[PDB]
Amino acid sequence: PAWXAXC
Amino acid sequence: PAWXAXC
Amino acid sequence: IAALVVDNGSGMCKAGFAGDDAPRAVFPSIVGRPRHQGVMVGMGQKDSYVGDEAQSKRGILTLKYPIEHGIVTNWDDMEKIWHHTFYNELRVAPEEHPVLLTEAPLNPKANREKMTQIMFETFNTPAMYVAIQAVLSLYASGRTTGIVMDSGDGVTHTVPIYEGYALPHAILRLDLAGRDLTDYLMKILTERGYSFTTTAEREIVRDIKEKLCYVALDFEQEMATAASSSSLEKSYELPDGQVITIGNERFRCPEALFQPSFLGMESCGIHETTFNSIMKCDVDIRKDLYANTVLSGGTTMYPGIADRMQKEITALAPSTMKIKIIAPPERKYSVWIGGSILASLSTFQQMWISKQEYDESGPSIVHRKCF
Amino acid sequence: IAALVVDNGSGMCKAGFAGDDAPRAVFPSIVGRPRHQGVMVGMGQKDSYVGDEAQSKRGILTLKYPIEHGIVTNWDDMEKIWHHTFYNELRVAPEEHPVLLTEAPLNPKANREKMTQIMFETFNTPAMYVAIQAVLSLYASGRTTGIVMDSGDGVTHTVPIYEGYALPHAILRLDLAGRDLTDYLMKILTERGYSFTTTAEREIVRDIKEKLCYVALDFEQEMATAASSSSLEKSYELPDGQVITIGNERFRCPEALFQPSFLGMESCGIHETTFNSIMKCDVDIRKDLYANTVLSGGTTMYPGIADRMQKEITALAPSTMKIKIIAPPERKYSVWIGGSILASLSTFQQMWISKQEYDESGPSIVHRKCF
Amino acid sequence: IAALVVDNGSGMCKAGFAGDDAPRAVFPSIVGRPRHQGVMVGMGQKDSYVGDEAQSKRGILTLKYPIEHGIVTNWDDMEKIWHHTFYNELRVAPEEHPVLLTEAPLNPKANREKMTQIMFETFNTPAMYVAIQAVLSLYASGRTTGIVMDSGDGVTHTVPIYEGYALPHAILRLDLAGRDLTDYLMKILTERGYSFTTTAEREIVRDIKEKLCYVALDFEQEMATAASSSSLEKSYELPDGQVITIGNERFRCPEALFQPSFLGMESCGIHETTFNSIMKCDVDIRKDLYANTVLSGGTTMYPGIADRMQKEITALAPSTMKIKIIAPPERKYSVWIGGSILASLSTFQQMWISKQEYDESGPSIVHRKCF
Ligand SMILES: Nc1ncnc2c1ncn2[C@@H]1O[C@H](COP(=O)(O)OP(=O)(O)O)[C@@H](O)[C@H]1O
Ligand SMILES: Nc1ncnc2c1ncn2[C@@H]1O[C@H](COP(=O)(O)OP(=O)(O)O)[C@@H](O)[C@H]1O
């Protein structure tokens, strides 16, 4: 969730 | 890591 | 009775009865287990899903590939793949039909031993053979003189085979394969902030590779275009609905087959290993190989890889040669098809090791026929 | 003129001039905003607060960290942080000194580009660089051969850099970090009766985490020690002065560093990512890497972590090999110590990108010597 | 002033002043370039490394041999080997001492010019000579007649030297040598599951070849013993501490010297090329030769190789010719030793091409000799 997709 | 001494 | 043909590929298991023109069973070679405690006991869960089951239930499972670079790393996982191959995917009692096993070149003696032991003693197959995958690849095009460049999820290899006899001393293996290109695809997608870490996420990246990557013909000019216009870049949407843009990365991933330095492998690229195997072949025969470079296995499916292999190996060959890259459709499952072809034949009907032979002579029969 | 070294950590920013052995300023990297209407017009209050001002006003602000997992999730709250870093905490004009920033491995390429634009076009710096956090550390350790496990509030990195020549392909980034363990500490403290929810309570949990918690040398045995005895019970007073008695919780909270399965991440423990990072490197250098394993960043400060690390990699690694977890006191700021050294190491004086270069090559200039 | 003696071997460069009975410098003839980026700029890192520096730095370098099979492949790389020899290995200015270069028989005539031109014009040698390697070997062995079987890393050379002269018509250059032999060890290791690919990894294998491998006096008898009992099995652990377990492989590798078929080589085996050389001689000197079989160069060191060579070549010769194998210790260096003796002769001290002679005649000095 910090990254774009993914986390 | 597959390989016994290498991958 | 019809013999059973099984292509033990590192990423996908292709299998069927002898004489089928295409495999019946085609499934990812995955054994799964649950990542979390089960709480709705009335569901009646099972402890390890396999194949398309594991791929259906993806995000609640850890996903194990039991085969790494042709080496069977986990045997009880692989034994479950074969159990599912036989009783469920093909629906057959493997103790009542002969069995044809594919195997990768330059793969250790113990792998064949344990394959043999499991077939002859877990599954009690009545007769069996283990074929060098490239033999089957060449046979699948109906030709009987050439060099095969096989490139699966786990192994890339070059095998010269002349009048149907292999050249064993002239074989090459390069472990840079489809999984490794999936690995590098992760890393480069991370540049645009698209992180992928879980095995489940790995499978997403595999899917992405399989539909937006392509082999650039001309890397320098391409990458100069990619730094000049957004027109080369496009998009895909996750099982989570959100869109992801694949760009410079599209070509950068598959470029690695020609430049293994990009994954920090000093090993030569696929054009160099093909050349370097042709140049291991006797000076007479090199012409006969250049008209007969056959590609096989699923990572040979990248668009333009034939064009690139040609335009590259062109430079490695002398001028005045018919450098022709044999890249047909069905190269996808070619290895298996070749198995089915060869399995149908009375000459090959001499080759199959009888269970009784192995039973009496122990591993000493296979210790020969592996060469 | 003296350059400035600033580490943009996900939890706390460390900054100062070059040459010094400790970073003068430590504003915990937090921006915070009034949770309610301001009523006393005579107080002279302000829109939002930062660092220790945010900590001072904590019980009435919603707190946001504008860096997560190293990604700068919000650019205006990061730029507020830099405005306070320079003009309030350090009382220096960044448009009169070169500046060195720090950044995580494998962070999205866009982050470096935005940072650069904010430095060159908000703060008008003369020249700039962005060192890869791990790298700086080995400088801080002196040793130029080693593998750095850096673990802070956000990221965790395990770079191996050898003979001073890196090995980028072997880098592994695990997004388990100090924030993640703060968040897990909330869950386990609930089991004995204590509720923590607000952003402000997250900092109280952080205080409990920085004082009473420690790493078990063997989880099962120490677990059993609780189950048998009160001997590991200790207590902490909240701001109310009420004491909260925590136990079985200390050696559980950080056991997550070795078992991320406790927190529903998939990837292996920091010991396993350490061993697996070494195993990516070419087989010669491994002897030297095992003898030069370096810890850095605030989450490496748990008591017992070295003992556990050393035994854990001693299980994974070979017998007839020596394992040296080089973990000094002051491991915490062993980055704005390495950056101090790097800006002092006058051979580096060509590396600072000049504003004139950035004003010609645009954001593309930042990809000079990074991963 | 004393002369400098240099042995331009394929694998290791043996060098030192004349009269000495052991060389003062012995190093692997490797130019090793970076595999990766030198991020820690404070190292003072080198554009390339050589000899023991490259072998220490093995894990981060691409190791290139400048001599392959027996010919120089890249002159500037060889030139670096020479530069390093003088200034670093011996710590001398090459302008200041006479110099001897070893050379192989039937090396094409242009090579002599390139070597000569480099030694006078790059290295300013005050006098120079170039010598047939094999002659030096017998010379060192004292005897004034015999057949040499010299084998290093690149070429196996057989020469019958008679009345102190090489007989050029009888010289059997064989392209099988240490390096080629190294490759085959890689394969037979692969059978048992050990892998090695990088050019760094090649040098690890070289270390194994120089330790565990040996020559069995009769192949299938030994192999039958080894197939029966694990008593013939030994071990040696890599830099990464894991032991390799090895039996059957130990005699199997150097068997190839007697069986070039194992590698698909069309050329005859080591005893064979020796006989095949003997038979070409002036018939009267046949018995003069058979009592005078002389072995040399690093590949000649394997235990049991002399006893095998005797039982082997005894078959090829008509019996009662009294074939005897000269193979004491120190035969690792006979070639360089010979030059050291030759360079001690006062007559030879007259016979060198002087610097003044080359400075008047240029490379044309060789055209009287080369035909
Ligand atoms: N359209 C495609 N483009 C590129 N690669 C593909 C494509 N389809 C499949 N692949 C690759 O083929 C590999 C497996 O091919 P296959 O040989 O059938 O299995 P295995 O390699 O296990 O024998 C996978 O790693 C996958 O990445
Ligand atoms: N004594 C301690 N033991 C364990 N963890 C600690 C201790 N002190 C601080 N920490 C953790 O370290 C985190 C900060 O990491 P640090 O390396 O100092 O900065 P960054 O997170 O920017 O790398 C804090 O969130 C805190 O939870």
Ligand SMILES: Nc1ncnc2c1ncn2[C@@H]1O[C@H](COP(=O)(O)OP(=O)(O)O)[C@@H](O)[C@H]1O
């Ligand atoms: N004790 C040994 N056992 C096995 N091989 C050896 C031994 N000593 C040397 N060699 C081999 O000899 C080769 C080089 O021989 P040498 O004649 O010394 O070098 P060059 O021909 O380059 O001068 C090396 O590749 C090495 O593997």
Ligand SMILES: [Mg+2]
């Ligand atoms: Mg396959």
Ligand SMILES: [Mg+2]
């Ligand atoms: Mg940090």
Ligand SMILES: [Mg+2]
């Ligand atoms: Mg030699």
